[PDB]
Design an enzyme around this catalytic site. Structure first.
Site, PDB file in Angstrom:
ATOM      1  CG  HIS A  43     -17.469  42.121  17.346  1.00 45.87           C
ATOM      2  ND1 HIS A  43     -16.361  43.029  17.632  1.00 45.87           N
ATOM      3  CD2 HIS A  43     -17.166  40.806  17.598  1.00 45.87           C
ATOM      4  CE1 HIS A  43     -16.065  42.011  18.469  1.00 45.87           C
ATOM      5  NE2 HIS A  43     -16.171  40.500  18.303  1.00 45.87           N
TER       6      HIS A  43
ATOM      7  NE  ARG B 228       5.889  25.567  23.197  1.00 48.04           N
ATOM      8  CZ  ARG B 228       5.258  26.037  24.396  1.00 48.04           C
ATOM      9  NH1 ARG B 228       6.517  26.625  25.211  1.00 48.04           N
ATOM     10  NH2 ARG B 228       4.320  27.244  24.469  1.00 48.04           N
TER      11      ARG B 228
ATOM     12  CE  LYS C  48       5.976  32.658  29.545  1.00 44.89           C
ATOM     13  NZ  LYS C  48       5.719  31.231  28.755  1.00 44.89           N
TER      14      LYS C  48
ATOM     15  CE1 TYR D   4      -7.127  38.313  21.779  1.00 51.49           C
ATOM     16  CE2 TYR D   4      -4.732  38.317  20.370  1.00 51.49           C
ATOM     17  CZ  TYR D   4      -6.179  38.219  19.909  1.00 51.49           C
ATOM     18  OH  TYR D   4      -6.396  37.528  19.106  1.00 51.49           O
TER      19      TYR D   4
ATOM     20  CD1 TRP E 107      10.323  31.608  26.203  1.00 52.49           C
ATOM     21  CD2 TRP E 107       8.937  33.265  26.074  1.00 52.49           C
ATOM     22  NE1 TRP E 107       9.116  31.808  26.350  1.00 52.49           N
ATOM     23  CE2 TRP E 107       8.432  32.645  26.013  1.00 52.49           C
ATOM     24  CE3 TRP E 107       9.129  34.919  25.644  1.00 52.49           C
ATOM     25  CZ2 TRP E 107       7.512  32.844  25.916  1.00 52.49           C
ATOM     26  CZ3 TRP E 107       7.836  35.220  25.177  1.00 52.49           C
ATOM     27  CH2 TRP E 107       6.241  34.258  26.026  1.00 52.49           C
TER      28      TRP E 107
ATOM     29  N   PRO F 286     -16.541  31.792  14.212  1.00 44.38           N
ATOM     30  CG  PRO F 286     -16.603  32.244  16.295  1.00 44.38           C
ATOM     31  CD  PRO F 286     -16.218  30.896  15.532  1.00 44.38           C
TER      32      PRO F 286
ATOM     33  CG  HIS G 182      -2.664  36.214  18.354  1.00 44.18           C
ATOM     34  ND1 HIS G 182      -1.852  34.744  19.137  1.00 44.18           N
ATOM     35  CD2 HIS G 182      -3.387  36.424  17.663  1.00 44.18           C
ATOM     36  CE1 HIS G 182      -3.572  34.257  18.765  1.00 44.18           C
ATOM     37  NE2 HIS G 182      -4.532  35.960  18.497  1.00 44.18           N
TER      38      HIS G 182
ATOM     39  CG  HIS H  79     -17.939  38.071  21.049  1.00 48.72           C
ATOM     40  ND1 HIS H  79     -17.586  39.123  21.750  1.00 48.72           N
ATOM     41  CD2 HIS H  79     -17.292  37.426  20.032  1.00 48.72           C
ATOM     42  CE1 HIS H  79     -16.300  39.393  20.979  1.00 48.72           C
ATOM     43  NE2 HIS H  79     -16.036  38.287  19.984  1.00 48.72           N
ATOM     44  CD  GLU H  80     -18.382  37.016  16.192  1.00 46.41           C
ATOM     45  OE1 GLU H  80     -17.882  37.276  15.582  1.00 46.41           O
ATOM     46  OE2 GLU H  80     -17.498  36.631  17.346  1.00 46.41           O
TER      47      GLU H  80
END
Ligand SMILES: *[C@@H]1O[C@H](CO)[C@@H](O[C@@H]2O[C@H](CO)[C@@H](O)[C@H](O)[C@H]2NC(C)=O)[C@H](O)[C@H]1NC(C)=O
Ligand SMILES: *[C@@H]1O[C@H](CO)[C@@H](O[C@@H]2O[C@H](CO)[C@@H](O)[C@H](O)[C@H]2NC(C)=O)[C@H](O)[C@H]1NC(C)=O
Ligand SMILES: *[C@@H]1O[C@H](CO)[C@@H](O[C@@H]2O[C@H](CO)[C@@H](O)[C@H](O)[C@H]2NC(C)=O)[C@H](O)[C@H]1NC(C)=O
Ligand SMILES: *[C@@H]1O[C@H](CO)[C@@H](O[C@@H]2O[C@H](CO)[C@@H](O)[C@H](O)[C@H]2NC(C)=O)[C@H](O)[C@H]1NC(C)=O
Ligand SMILES: *[C@@H]1O[C@H](CO)[C@@H](O[C@@H]2O[C@H](CO)[C@@H](O)[C@H](O)[C@H]2NC(C)=O)[C@H](O)[C@H]1NC(C)=O
Ligand SMILES: *[C@@H]1O[C@H](CO)[C@@H](O[C@@H]2O[C@H](CO)[C@@H](O)[C@H](O)[C@H]2NC(C)=O)[C@H](O)[C@H]1NC(C)=O
Ligand SMILES: *[C@@H]1O[C@H](CO)[C@@H](O)[C@H](O)[C@H]1NC(C)=O
Ligand SMILES: *[C@@H]1O[C@H](CO)[C@@H](O)[C@H](O)[C@H]1NC(C)=O
Ligand SMILES: *[C@@H]1O[C@H](CO)[C@@H](O)[C@H](O)[C@H]1NC(C)=O
Ligand SMILES: *[C@@H]1O[C@H](CO)[C@@H](O)[C@H](O)[C@H]1NC(C)=O
Lengths: 176, 698, 698, 177
Positions: C360, C151, C463, C497, C459, C328, C487, C356-357
């Site tokens: 999809h 950071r 937080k 998410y 921010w 994956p 992200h 999980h995969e």
């Protein structure tokens, strides 16, 4: 009957310069052809032919030399082999035969040693077998971690690819 | 009986068992260097530790025979090599600290990285990184960035390590009955013959001072010619009468000027001698190059190789997968085994390097009859001098014409000779003042003449005075610029290159005189001359068994270092440079710097002064620059590191200038800094509790 | 003839042509990832670029049919992804600048390096470096160095890039008739059925606030229990009342708390459920894991594989020398071809990732009959929710016991249920407040509610308030801590998410009710239930062809997001955390910080304040710290960066504290700093032309 | 004795669905199949008693179908090939045969097409060849870069490894009169 000479020239496992064991002991194969031999220098009976000559004391012997000490096998000169290991008489009669051994005496497992130190001058044609530890002043030391005592039998250290002069030479000395 | 009747047996015991262990140590080193992989460095170490432990075990055993009661030369020299290069008399934690310091210095030098200011993720190393930038780039700003990023991100790390290294090495060398570590490096070139007529350790300093004063006009004219040619490129950046900037010399340290040859070439239409195409066109390989070198060495009179040289020494890169180090070295493994390890190519420089390494081998092959302690050069200069002088004759464009490398239609005009001489002088003459100044700095640091607070000031003062090189950025005591060189960070002596050059040119003139050469010295070839080979091999055969003055007397007919051979070699180049530097200024003044014209003189008139006053003043100057540029709507974050202090007299005055952040080449103009000081005058002097009379800002 | 009688023919021309170009683009992407090498990366720029250029080419051929005249749903929705996902309406230089900014942020994130004041050659990237340090180390100082090193050497570089990134993205989204870029990201979760009863883009912000207040009682008890267990380790560093430090959360950003499980495990004598040794003992390989995973989906009624899945998709590390990426992913290449690209091992979490995969994949197989525009999830949250809910039913110790992986004598008591439930909550509950505010911070940045001078003030205020996490080092506007996440630097929406977690247990509670489950929700398996998969396959069968509200209504009998099923899942854990947090304090106050109770309150009483006196004050403090430690014979080079300013009110007051150089965790004690200002009071107020009354130094 | 049912099943180089041709021309090969037929749905005549039933004239057609249109070849049914490429009469006798060709029609060079757009409905059993560009309003185009104009003959785009449903299918009919 033919003279026994071929039992050791075409054999292996020669001893060192301190373990030379003599034999009692045809002659044509030594000088005819035999170009693989490193040197043919011959003090005494000369390089003439041995055709039905009458000779006695035909005892001969062989030992393994580092390569620069081959010149030390001659009468009336100084050298570590002459002074400590193998001495020839001044009026030497006989001859010598020598040849290179590039990969014959140079495996991983080999042990060749020379007597670097002993008490006093040596005389021709006698054997020094004992591994008594040499003392610089005299007497004995009976230990290694002190001044004045050194181990006498130092190794040649034959490894392949060392060049001419440290590559093993199998020399055979003839006496007449 | 007497000690002389025990020392010879002790030395006879030593050599005949040290030879074996040295042979396995050299074999382990060879089997590592040709086979860089795992389970290869883990066999040098226990063999090397065995040889070392035996070596100091004999060294402890060696101190039983004093040198006074022995009179014969070789055993006395062997015992002189012994009893002094043994275990260092030091505390165990001190020795561990010294080893840790040396390892940390080597690791910092080898793994130091320098990142770009605009791109912090694009970082460069030194050997494959910044070296290419200093050797190839012609940009002033990029060269300045590469010169400043190195030795600030590396030298500042090396400064306290170098201070502790100096202290520990002085403590170690004082225990060897020497006075200084520089005196311990001068244990070479130390002889004795009769009645105290030997070469003293203090005689070397006087001799190299005399040699440096005797090369002053030639180096001055070369420096003037380089400075004149460095004004076509880099305009408005190099003063016609000042010193050269340190970052425009062809290398990170200004050691070799040979990368300035394309910039300073005379008669550029004339091509230089390069037979690479003419050698790849005839189907040449490593074997042909080494056979031609062996044929050259046979023709002068030196013998053949030992036939184990061909079958064991790797000559080119191996075909299979086996990592190697591609540094051309000649290996004397001992016990009659000689090898050369290099990654050669079909190139002219590799063709000369093969001759250099085979000359090193022929040096090593000659003293094989000597005992093990005397199997070296007579000093640390003769070995590399012989290696360099055996490759000097084969670079002549007459030896190549005989070999068919050069076409007979090539013209040997007097301009190609000038080009070759200038390339040689950039290689050879341009590194003598740098080497002399660096060794003088190291000697005066080890002597204690330079205090720890004046390392950098004295370093750059001698760089300006002796080398004629000025720094582009001022450096305080935080920096350590000598440690940025490989030979200084890795604890290596450096005067051996100076002595190498002097002895190489002495040997060249002697061998050319023996070989009945008639023309100029730079066009001399000693090939097909058995007379030069005999007097060469007479020098080659003896190693440390004779004093180097006596060995030198037998070949060049002189017992002293003479640079007259060097000046006769470069005489056409000297008389051409004297004509070229007719309308220019030969010399330099130690006052001009790239930051001199934009620096503001500040005089201190008293409150109590220390190093913290510098930080407060630099921070106040940075705040003043921030306030000045904020009024012009240019928000620039000036810092303490953006203010540089030069000519720091710690009692009366100093100079300062301001640089833009992220651009070390962007010096703020002197008018803008003066305007900032005038606008923010109250905040500058009110923090120090003084008026304009105390700090009047000249 | 008319509109809706020529629009479908244009739509039919797209559907039977774009699937050919998408298949070639997907095949190029598939052949790249399994064969990472040269001469393959340009296939996306040669074959996929043709599909990329074709997409906006039809957008200009679109917009000729008005959306108001058409009334039928399957062609109105297909014209809604079209006419908006075309070429971004921007100038040529601005669109070129936006692509260079996004490429620079991804390069800085993936190539940044962080390392220590000591040994600055030893450094680490992020993925194989500090992620290991921040995930495994229990050292307070080592974790703080990696957190503060990040950071600051990376996040400070992204701060000027992110400021230009916000302006360019807001201009691009305003050309799409959206109010900002945050509303453009909320163009998903947006339906319309009748009379304006659809899900508004502003309706999403109201619902995520309603969900976050409902998870607050569960998260506060989880936060209080973790804080209590984070006082055994790290003593005298975590307040029992205040917030948790940001560098003690299990990773760099505190996104997942799952690495804090060894520190905060209850009943450590009871071992966790692991079948890694069980599968390798029974001879399980890559094919056996997927074959057993496929049998789970057949048992609920979902169809088999497409038989090209086995022959084409890589299921293990390739034997030949083909470089791959081991992430994956489930690939829907189009034209009835489905593949999975992952490097499998015989390990328990690779067994759950296979479920999980392939979830999809089973999602992708169901809507293959839909046209190409509607071949997605009903929103961005359903796609990852289907994969997680399938893997949720196979991690229970009843599905594993049936398959023989778990021995029948395993002790499934109530103690091991808490260990399983808590390990879920540190990955499920603990990531929800972090996901909520980071999107909330990003939304208010795009809406202009947070000015550019308060990006870092807001921010860390949210937080502390919403997450209960306090920073250990104060950060001014030069830092960009949101950009340090993957992200945010790579321009990815993060609300996918937050709503995924809500849609996990909403589907899980509905499917377990159909599957006639009786006990607790966390011990439910939907295997061998054709009725559960029948209502499941109805939701999978439709993609974007239906609004997600009525698609959700058909499975869970609700048109809104409900977190009630999520709280019922963790009800045994929630009723146990309340018993543990009986003698402790549930909640936090936003006043305590690791740098609190050591800083000094400074009040400003006016000369003019223009953010340049901050540099002068932090330098005068650093000069005072240098002068204080110099009189104690401790020469420490305090700098401006060693003075940290927090609680900066630009009008009245601020707080400051001093840390040691080379150690960010070494805060100088308040008694030593106050004594430094006292004896250096004269030179700390006169620099600002003021007396001791103006700066009170409370 | 002899029934020319050959040259349509073992023959190679099948055309597209818009390029079908007839042969004009043994029911044991339908049961003892050389290739595993994918479908055997038959309406009208029962496909269990064929040898005893006589015939007057029998015709055979052969073409290539994407695979999801194999269900689409049936009397009185809709669909893109039924609407534009190949329509069957409502009073249909005989039936169809189809089989997968996974690695026979899926090399690098294989170009197949179907008529996606065409003006009007197609009557059963005729042919369309012309590649005139389809216009949404009507008439002709003489320009590909204009509104409402699309290329009619769209490619199947056969590549290996596409899964069942997009695999090349050889469809052979045996309808008689
Ligand atoms: C380079 O070194 C490797 C080991 O570091 C050598 O590999 C060994 O070769 C000997 C042959 O005598 C084997 O007995 C060992 O088992 C080998 N070890 C390993 C790890 O492979 C290799 O032979 C060396 N290269 C050459 C040319 O000798
Ligand atoms: C050294 O002298 C020898 C012989 O005098 C030279 O060898 C001759 O070189 C020429 C030119 O390359 C050849 O044409 C001859 O065949 C060589 N042999 C003889 C016997 O003449 C050799 O080139 C000379 N070397 C130098 C450097 O001058
Ligand atoms: C950094 O500063 C240098 C020096 O000021 C800039 O290089 C050029 O310097 C000359 C004079 O020394 C000026 O006339 C030019 O305008 C400068 N710029 C260019 C592009 O030639 C350099 O540009 C500055 N910036 C960087 C990124 O190096
Ligand atoms: C992985 O990629 C390489 C090239 O990036 C492929 O090598 C090519 O293979 C095709 C197959 O017919 C050849 O026509 C090319 O000449 C090859 N090029 C090179 C440079 O070798 C390789 O085949 C790929 N791997 C797999 C499994 O397909
Ligand atoms: C789903 O149901 C099937 C059929 O009842 C189960 O398969 C049998 O399960 C029993 C008991 O677990 C085993 O003894 C048999 O060996 C299984 N296989 C047979 C009969 O072929 C299957 O285990 C069930 N799966 C789950 C997860 O409940
Ligand atoms: C850097 O500072 C930290 C924190 O002051 C040092 O870590 C320990 O901190 C505790 C209290 O927080 C002290 O009681 C210890 O004496 C500190 N040292 C040790 C070794 O535990 C840390 O040592 C400092 N130095 C480095 C290099 O991190
Ligand atoms: C050196 O070697 C060459 C080539 O083997 C040979 O012709 C020449 O006679 C040798 N010279 C000596 C002195 O051995
Ligand atoms: C070379 O010689 C010519 C003829 O005397 C002379 O004019 C020229 O200056 C010389 N060049 C050099 C570089 O000495
Ligand atoms: C799925 O595949 C298995 C394995 O061949 C088979 O036993 C099962 O009948 C198949 N189920 C369906 C619905 O095709
Ligand atoms: C588990 O059940 C036992 C017996 O009812 C009880 O004593 C214990 O507290 C329970 N533990 C938990 C974590 O609920």
């Amino acid at each position: 009957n033919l003279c026994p000479f071929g039992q050791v020239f075409n054999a292996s496992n020669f001893p060192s310069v301190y373990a030379w064991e003599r034999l009692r002991i045809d002659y044509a194969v030594l000088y005819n052809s035999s170009s693989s031999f490193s040197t043919f220098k011959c003090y005494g009976v000369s390089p003439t032919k041995l055709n039905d000559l009458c000779f006695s004391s035909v005892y001969a012997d062989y030992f393994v030399v580092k390569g620069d000490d081959v010149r030390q096998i001659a009468p009336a000169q100084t050298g570590v082999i002459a002074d400590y290991n193998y001495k020839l008489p001044d009026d030497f009669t006989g001859c010598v035969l020598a040849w290179n051994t590039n990969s014959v005496d140079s495996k991983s497992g080999n042990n060749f040693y020379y007597r670097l130190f002993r008490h006093g001058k040596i005389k021709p044609y006698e054997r020094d077998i004992s591994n008594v530890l040499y003392n610089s002043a005299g007497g004995t030391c009976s230990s290694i971690s002190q001044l004045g005592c050194y181990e006498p039998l130092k190794s040649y250290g034959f490894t392949p690819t060392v060049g001419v002069g440290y590559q093993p030479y199998r020399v055979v000395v003839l006496s007449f | 009986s007497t000690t002389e009747d025990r020392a010879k047996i002790f030395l006879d015991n030593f050599n005949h068992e040290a030879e074996d262990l040295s042979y396995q140590s050299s074999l382990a080193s060879w089997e590592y260097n040709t086979n860089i992989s795992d389970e290869n460095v883990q066999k040098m170490d226990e063999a090397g530790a065995k040889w070392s432990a035996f070596y100091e075990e004999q060294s402890k055993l060696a101190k039983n025979y004093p040198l006074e009661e022995i009179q014969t030369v070789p055993v006395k020299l062997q015992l002189q090599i012994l009893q002094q290069s043994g275990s260092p008399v030091l505390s165990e934690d001190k020795s561990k600290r010294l080893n840790s310091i040396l390892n940390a210095m080597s690791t910092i030098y080898s793994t130091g990285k320098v990142c770009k200011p605009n791109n912090p993720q694009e970082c460069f190393l030194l050997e494959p990184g910044l070296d290419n930038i200093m050797g190839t780039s012609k940009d002033y700003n990029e060269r300045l960035w590469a010169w400043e990023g190195w030795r600030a991100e590396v030298g500042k790390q090396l400064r306290p390590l170098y201070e502790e290294y100096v202290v520990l090495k002085n403590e170690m060398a004082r225990g060897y009955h020497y006075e200084d570590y520089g005196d311990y490096w001068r244990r070479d070139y130390e002889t004795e013959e009769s009645s105290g007529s030997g070469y003293s350790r203090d005689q070397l300093m006087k001799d190299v001072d005399r040699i440096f004063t005797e090369i002053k006009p030639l180096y001055e004219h070369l420096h003037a010619y380089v400075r004149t040619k460095l004004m076509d490129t880099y305009p408005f950046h190099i003063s016609p009468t000042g010193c050269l900037p340190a970052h425009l010399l062809g290398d990170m340290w200004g050691r070799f000027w040979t990368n300035l040859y394309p910039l300073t070439v005379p008669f550029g239409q004339k091509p230089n001698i390069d037979v690479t195409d003419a050698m790849v066109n005839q189907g040449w390989d490593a074997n042909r190059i080494f056979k031609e070198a062996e044929k050259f060495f046979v023709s002068v009179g030196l013998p053949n190789m030992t036939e184990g040289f061909w079958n064991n020494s790797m000559l080119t890169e191996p075909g299979d997968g086996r990592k190697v180090v591609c540094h051309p070295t000649a290996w004397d493994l001992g016990k009659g085994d000689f090898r050369i390890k290099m990654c050669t190519k079909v190139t002219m420089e590799d063709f000369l390097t093969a001759h250099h390494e085979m000359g090193h081998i022929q040096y090593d092959m000659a003293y094989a009859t000597q005992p093990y302690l005397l199997r070296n050069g007579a000093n640390e200069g003769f070995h590399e001098a012989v290696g360099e002088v055996m490759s000097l004759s084969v670079a002549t464009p007459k030896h190549l014409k005989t070999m068919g490398l050069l076409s007979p239609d090539f013209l040997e005009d007097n301009e190609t000779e000038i080009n070759f001489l200038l390339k040689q002088a950039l290689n050879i003459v341009g590194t003598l003042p740098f080497t002399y100044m660096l060794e003088k700095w190291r000697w005066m640091v080890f002597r204690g003449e330079i205090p720890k607070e004046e390392w950098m000031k004295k370093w750059w003062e001698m760089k300006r005075d002796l080398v004629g090189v000025v720094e582009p950025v001022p450096h305080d005591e935080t920096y350590c610029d000598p440690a940025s060189l490989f030979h200084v960070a890795n604890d290596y002596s450096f005067i051996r290159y100076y002595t190498r050059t002097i002895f190489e040119f002495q040997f060249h003139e002697a061998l050319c005189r023996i070989a009945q050469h008639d023309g100029p010295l730079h066009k001399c070839d000693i090939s097909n001359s058995t007379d030069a080979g005999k007097k060469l091999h007479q020098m080659l055969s003896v190693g440390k068994s004779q004093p180097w003055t006596v060995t030198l007397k037998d070949i060049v007919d002189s017992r002293n270092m003479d640079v007259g051979p060097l000046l006769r070699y470069f005489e056409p180049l000297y008389t051409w440079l004297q004509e070229q530097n007719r309308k220019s200024h030969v010399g330099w003044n130690t006052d001009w710097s790239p930051y001199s014209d934009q620096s503001i003189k500040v005089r201190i008139s008293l409150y109590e002064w220390n190093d913290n006053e510098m930080y407060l003043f630099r921070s106040s100057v940075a705040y003043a620059m921030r306030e000045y540029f904020s009024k012009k709507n240019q928000p620039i974050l000036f810092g303490v590191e953006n203010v540089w202090v030069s000519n720091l007299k710690p009692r009366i005055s100093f100079n300062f200038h301001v640089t833009s952040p992220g651009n070390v080449s962007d010096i703020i103009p002197r008018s803008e800094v003066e305007g900032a000081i005038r606008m923010s005058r109250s905040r500058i002097n009110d923090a120090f509790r003084l008026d304009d009379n105390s700090l009047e800002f000249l």
